């Protein structure tokens, strides 16, 4: 990583626990925001380390590879490189797989991050990283948000938890994600706790649900 | 973080704690200061960070979002942005959703945070998320303060224990507390007890109350 | 803490070993000394956080907060405040709930701990939990000194580890120790081993004494 | 390491982090990055370190060992070393064996690799060990690509796991991975999942190709 | 500790490694250098930080704090302390009780360590705490060097192993322990052993000794 | 350590790893880069804190006593001390015993790896220590190069596995090893693999003889 700004290796206890949040975790949600905690401030260098250290899951790490070629041929699209010999004060431009770390140094990525009019390839790469992880995190989940209905006997804050996990894991539009919200959630509970919630009214907080229905 | 002023990424042994505290303790009271004590000196980002590596407990995380938004909305209200173009030497006011993080830059945080007539917004948003989080450990705590009851055999401490553990979860204003304190306790100990912490006196020290209940 | 003078928060190893500390050895009296030890150049608010992350034990946490709201009140008696506005060079004087952290922010606690003519907030509130503990620790010694006596098996060292063990716990002055050395860990000391202690002299150290009752 | 640049000692978490690896994962590929990544600004006698530590598996450190004799012999046959006394103001060129670390000192390496016009002796040493690494890793592949088909009831994400697991281990040149990924892979389908993706098209992406057999 | 001159206050690693190793070793001869490495460079402050986190063994820390006692006692008859007000450009002269830390604050040790013609108070207590640390490790060694023979069926290997290991104990002075490594070793051999030892000659090495009795 | 120059005490963690690498390891060859990777930059203070920290095993330590009592002699007679008062810009000449840290202080060690002309008295004492220990490994390696003989159904691997193990045991010189290699290895497979590798030539690498008999 790079730190308030001078340059550091990735270190043992941040790569070991990549690696075993790798193995635990398989590809839960938890583990995107998990992986960009442990590469803040990363090079290309450190997340293409991040990611190939991870032993198995190769089918998932093809994926991947190839959502990041996507996004680099899309940059190569949208910033076509000039013909011309670099300056003594600059810095050639980057194209799609020096974001990737592929075609680049740790020297020239170092130096696109550092210098004035900052090319933040680091984020950049970990935007299309995160955008292929997300891909993979929809495809593995198991369920469907229109499937997730309560359980007679099942207390309504289970059945929340399970309905707001496949929903983190569905990761539609927030305007989607919102009328899911207004309609599936009363729509699929029992009948003991739907008709409360129904007599609650069309506005109430997910506070004055659960408490609702909680002696229920 | 920042440390004194200077950036820092939050470490792995920080956040692989916090996870581990969720796993563990749930949401007992002292979740919340290990959380706060986790989080000292964090950005929003570094917040939503340790908020996002939740698994599971997906029902407590969506009411927190919903108080999060409540204090954003009453911050907008109180803040009205003016309009007009920023000027050189300034930086933008932050709305709401730029101190929950979900608006804002890193370097915008950090730009709030270290600029001079600051807007400590890593604090603010930890009073919303500490606000939310009362909230979620008040509605999961399974007893009230009323029905705290020493058994007949139950040696003082033990009871003394239960009764300020489920205090310490009822998080009402700290004169009822006092209340709470001056009239459940000697009033739901047991006979044997509750005649010699009559014979104290109205104004005894849980000291004094628990060395004279002690042999008993 | 605070270390040479610049600010740091408590590190997620410190609170963990502070926690588990508690959690395995209770109220024994070494973990004063370990409290004192994870709290070396702590400001009040490390020190609230070291005391509010503690699950359970809620007993001896609210006779904590008795013997601090005590300490605070006679702070305030000893030091009455003086009515007028603080000029531009200075700092308020801190009260009683200031040096406990409870109404005194954390920029106001470094300004009382770096700024020349130093008021150790720290160490004064650290002292008045020290105290607190202490009375904890006496409280929740289940032996009195009196009481321990060497069995007509049991080898002399064993017998002064549980005297001095207990002695310990007592916690009254030097010279009442002193006397209770030089009285009672000869007087309940077995037949063979009082017989031989007796004939070493009244000044034998305990080296002496525990040599000349080694095969024996 | 050397890190912006200074010098350090090769830390012990660094290195019992590499000896754990070699217990584990044997000469797994993934192996490889994380030799490369406890090992980020390494000196040769860092990287002699770490070869070193290695208990057992001496059959594939002697293979490493001829493979960097190899490297070292076709540097010192590209690079020839003039004689001449060494300038007050110079060091001397590094022969294969300095690089190596087995006959430069630690002044030496750490000499050329800070000097302006800098000779990174780690990063060609390091270049060397990936180098017999990937040898290692290949020679120790117990299957070949060939080999890999989808059985009648193995799930498509399975076969395609085994599949680029395998093709990993294969590591030949990118053109020929490519020639193997467009017809091995649906060549060695099963017919159920076959069939389907005969029918996607030549150049489908491997999502669409596990999204068309997921339910089958 | 102080590093190189600035202060920190003992790591939690440290003193949960004392901790551990008081717990495990009980008192092995290993335990006093192993303190003296987690001591390095510390005030005496640390060192009674140290020794309060032990908890049991009360028998052997009262001992220790006997001997202290008695240096402190010799460090006071030796530098007879001079009555005078201490001089603004100086510091008191240190009795033994402050060099043990009982009545000087940690600004006053600091302050004699590191000014100019340096009072090395904490190694002066060191000395002091290892004097103590080695009459305990002898008093409760469990065997004599006289009583340590070889059995007819064992290796030599292991008779010299538990030879010098009781030699360690003894803790004589280093021409008493030459001695008794001139004779007790081949004296209290095995009859097969001892005759090949006696044919070596009177000066040979350990090294040769340990391979004339190898294949023996 | 000493690391880049400003002085440092030896950590728990590298003392820790030290003790259990001696605890798990006992004398494995690997065990001496491992020192020599935990003991970088050390003065001798740090080099006799490791060597005294080890439990057991004294006959080995005993031995190694005697080789750096042998190579503190050697380095006397080649470095005669001259008598003279030691000038005002000056440090003394070490003496063999100086050098292993058993009559020099720390700030005298510190001196004489500091000053220009630099008496690296950390890396003497680190060549004797290694010296010493090469010495044990080769007492205590229970197996000679010339009874390696590969088993009729021993696979190829397994069999140079345990060949270059006794090899890195047997610390002869390097020529030696190389007729070790040329002869004995092929010597002494069995007769499938023993044939092919006779149809090979005496030119190949161990490469071309694994892959080979890989089959076979
Ligand atoms: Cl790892
Ligand atoms: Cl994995
Ligand atoms: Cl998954
Ligand atoms: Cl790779
Ligand atoms: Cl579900
Ligand atoms: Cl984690
Ligand atoms: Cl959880
Ligand atoms: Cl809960
Ligand atoms: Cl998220
Ligand atoms: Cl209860
Ligand atoms: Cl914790
Ligand atoms: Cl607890
Ligand atoms: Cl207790
Ligand atoms: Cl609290
Ligand atoms: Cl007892
Ligand atoms: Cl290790
Ligand atoms: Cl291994
Ligand atoms: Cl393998
Ligand atoms: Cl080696
Ligand atoms: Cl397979
Ligand atoms: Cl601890
Ligand atoms: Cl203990
Ligand atoms: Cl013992
Ligand atoms: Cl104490
Ligand atoms: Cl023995
Ligand atoms: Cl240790
Ligand atoms: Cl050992
Ligand atoms: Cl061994
Ligand atoms: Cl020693
Ligand atoms: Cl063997």
């Given at each position: 990583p790079i730190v308030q700004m001078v340059h550091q290796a990735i270190?043992?206890?941040?790569?070991?626990?990549?690696?075993?949040?790798?193995?635990?975790?398989?590809?839960?949600?938890?583990?995107?925001?998990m992986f960009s905690a442990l590469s803040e401030?990363?090079?290309?260098?450190?997340?293409?380390?991040?990611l190939n250290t991870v032993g198995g899951h190769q089918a998932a790490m093809q994926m991947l590879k190839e959502t990041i070629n996507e996004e680099a041929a899309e940059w190569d699209r949208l910033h076509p490189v000039h013909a011309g010999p670099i300056a003594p004060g600059?810095?050639?431009?980057?194209?799609?797989s020096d974001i990737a770390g592929t075609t680049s140094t740790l020297q020239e990525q170092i130096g696109w991050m550092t210098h004035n009019a900052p090319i933040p390839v680091g984020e950049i790469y970990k935007r299309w990283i995160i955008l292929g992880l997300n891909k993979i995190v929809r495809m593995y989940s198991p369920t469907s948000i229109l499937?997730?209905?309560?359980?007679?006997?099942?207390?309504?804050?289970?059945?929340?938890?399970?309905?707001?996990?496949?929903?983190?894991?569905?990761?539609?539009?927030?305007?989607?994600?919102?009328?899911?919200?207004?309609?599936?959630?009363?729509?699929?509970?029992?009948?003991?706790?739907?008709?409360?919630?129904?007599?609650?009214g069309p506005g109430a907080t997910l506070e004055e649900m659960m408490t609702a229905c909680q002696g229920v």
């Open positions: 270190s043992p206890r941040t790569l070991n626990a990549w690696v075993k949040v790798v193995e635990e975790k398989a590809f839960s949600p938890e583990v995107i925001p401030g990363a090079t290309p260098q450190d997340l293409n380390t991040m600059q810095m050639r431009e980057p194209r799609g499937d997730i209905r309560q359980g007679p006997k099942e207390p309504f804050r289970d059945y929340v938890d399970r309905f707001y996990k496949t929903l983190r894991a569905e990761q539609a539009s927030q305007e989607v994600k919102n009328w899911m919200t207004e309609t599936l959630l009363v729509q699929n509970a029992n009948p003991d706790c739907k008709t409360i919630l129904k007599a609650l």
